[PDB]
Amino acid sequence: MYEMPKLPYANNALEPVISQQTIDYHYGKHLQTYVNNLNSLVPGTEYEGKTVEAIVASAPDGAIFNNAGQVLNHTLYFLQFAPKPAKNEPAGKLGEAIKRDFGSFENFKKEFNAASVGLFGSGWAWLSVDKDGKLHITKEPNGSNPVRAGLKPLLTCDVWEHAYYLDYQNRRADHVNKLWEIIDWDVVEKRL
Amino acid sequence: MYEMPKLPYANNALEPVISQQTIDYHYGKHLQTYVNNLNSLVPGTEYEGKTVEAIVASAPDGAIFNNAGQVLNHTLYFLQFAPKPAKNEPAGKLGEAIKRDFGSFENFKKEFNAASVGLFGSGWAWLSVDKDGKLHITKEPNGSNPVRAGLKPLLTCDVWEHAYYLDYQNRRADHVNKLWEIIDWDVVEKRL
Ligand SMILES: [Fe+3]
Ligand SMILES: [Fe+3]
């Protein structure tokens, strides 16, 4: 049975980047529904007893994939943030890979922002690493996650409107720009 | 040169089904941006001088299509509502076609609701008529519109979260159920 992941911060701790209200709905309602849906859809199927990751890696398009992908996406999303990150940029191997693959962190930010803002409709902008250690930015529609393509997901921006509408309404770009301030690079680095 | 369509009611007139705030953002920002984007993108292309409808019917996937589809979708959407419709259900030819194709109005509502609630991500539930006079319910992802497929669009529900999030947050089904009270069947009938 799939369980709600625990937030490593209080509901109001990401203010003013993300409001308490947004967390209450985004985590407390949307993620809860996705978890509930996955627990309802799986019993008696080949997916019963599989991890979220394994479902995302295996399932074809459909409700199971949609819900598993959203569980995985939101889990990594919420757990990649911290109220007051020590570092506002990655170091070590991740830092070097970003310099190698994007020229610099600042250029990476620019490309990540553009992917986030340019994704039409609902989805996720993802930074991932492939099996040869190369980084990629992808636009995952709807509930998709880079695990399906055999990539290892490192950092994401949720550009479903529910992620920002109560705080930014239509101003997605403004929301995206603020997210950099709450990324917990220690968490992200450990995903490499 | 693409113009904002005129709302046939005041911004606050659909309360409490849709709030003034929602109309101010949905019409006054989102639709405005789509129209602005058409005015930015179309002049100087093969689409210059064409109607929105013709662009939706002809353009491939991409930003022009996305914007045109959204302009058409929102135009029909906003103009299909009235604060106090004359009737709560369609009459005449449309009334009969609905009975023919869905068994009854009530069953049509049920199937329309299910398409609306079941569309994952951003999109539009559409009732349309084909060239032989037969009705169809489709789920159009993102900016898509039935005109692309050669159908004539009659009635839609916008299930992009921006359409309802300020008023219903995650409770899409509740929003969908309330819309029926403000459908201006006189407008919809004349689209047949
Ligand atoms: Fe989300
Ligand atoms: Fe909309």
Author numbering:
A (entry chain B), B (entry chain A): 1 to 192
Task: Give verbatim lines from the article.
Here we studied metal-preference evolution within the natural diversity of the iron/manganese superoxide dismutase (SodFM) family of reactive oxygen species scavengers. Only a few metalloenzymes have been rigorously demonstrated to be cambialistic in vivo, including some iron (Fe)- or manganese (Mn)-dependent superoxide dismutases (SODs; SodFMs); metalloenzymes that play an important role in cellular reactive oxygen species defence. To study this process, we leveraged the existence of naturally Fe-specific, Mn-specific and flexible Fe/Mn-cambialistic SodFM homologues, which differentially utilize these metals to catalyse the detoxification of superoxide. By combining phylogenetics, biochemistry and structural biology, we demonstrate that SodFM metal utilization can be evolutionarily fine tuned by sliding along a scale between perfect manganese and iron specificities.
a,b, Residues at the XD-2 position in cambialistic S. aureus SodFM1 (LD-2, a) and B. fragilis SodFM2 (GD-2, b) were mutated to those found commonly at this position in natural SodFMs. In the cambialistic SodFM2 from B. fragilis (b), all mutants displayed lower activity with Mn and the majority had higher activity with Fe, representing change towards its most likely ancestral Fe-preferring phenotype. c, For Fe-preferring CPR Wolfebacteria SodFM1 (CPR-His), mutations in both the XD-2 and water-coordinating H/Q residues were necessary to shift towards the inferred ancestral higher Mn activity. Importantly, consistent with previous reports, comparison of four protein crystal structures of the WT and mutant SodFMs we determined here indicated that metal-preference modulation by XD-2 and Q/H occurs without any significant changes to the secondary metal coordination sphere within the resolution limits of the solved structures. This provides further support for ‘redox tuning’ via subtle structural changes.
